[PDB]
Amino acid sequence: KQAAQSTFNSFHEWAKQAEAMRNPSRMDIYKIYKQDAPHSHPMSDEQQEEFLHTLKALNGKNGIEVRTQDHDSVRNKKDRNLDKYIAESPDAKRFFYRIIPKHERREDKNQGRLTIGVQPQYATQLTRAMATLIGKESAITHGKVIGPACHGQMTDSAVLYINGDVAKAEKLGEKLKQMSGIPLDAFVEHTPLSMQSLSKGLSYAESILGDTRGHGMSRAEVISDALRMDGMPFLARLKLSLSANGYDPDNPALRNT
């Protein structure tokens, strides 16, 4: 409720900035969300290398696999050789990696997404904790982490994809924090627009209908719709656009009902 209010208000602010623009495109609206990313200076060269080496060390152990999310690798079924990709790809420090359980878990059409924000110096530690948590918790279908050169500069540097609701995410979040060994001050105070803050560095949002546009683009498009409606206050149009698009009109982070 209080959670819902803070979340809606950041969504509404975003929407007002979109509304102030002249004939804004969906992409324009989306860039406002992208522009609001945290902007940490990257971890050092050695820290990046330690990150890649940890990925390779994690891959294939304790029920976990790590695969590049590089599109070319994926479609060619080449994403199954982590060590070779890191060795050769000039994008290895930049692209996303997914952390998956050895035995694939079916995704619900409606998933929760837990976004985790730590200082880039702790990315490796977080990644280890994510792998352990994914190993143990079958509610989590997979995780993803951005390459070490970009960790701390994206709205989505680290994400867990969860079959479950906000309560399940809260529990996994508190679990992640207590088990990671990462100092509490090292979590980054930042909540992406229209996501619900669970605690410092932990933000939650829900996706529907098997959506894969991503949280920013999906909520950007709710705003576009509201802008296209007429005859009602802008505030009511946003709430109506949320409902009509399947989200909770009082908490844009959540599915409707």
Automatic annotation (TrEMBL):
Domain of life: Bacteria
Protein's UniProt name: Type III effector HopA1
Gene giving rise to this polypeptide: hopA1
Entire-sequence positions represented here: 123 to 379 of 380
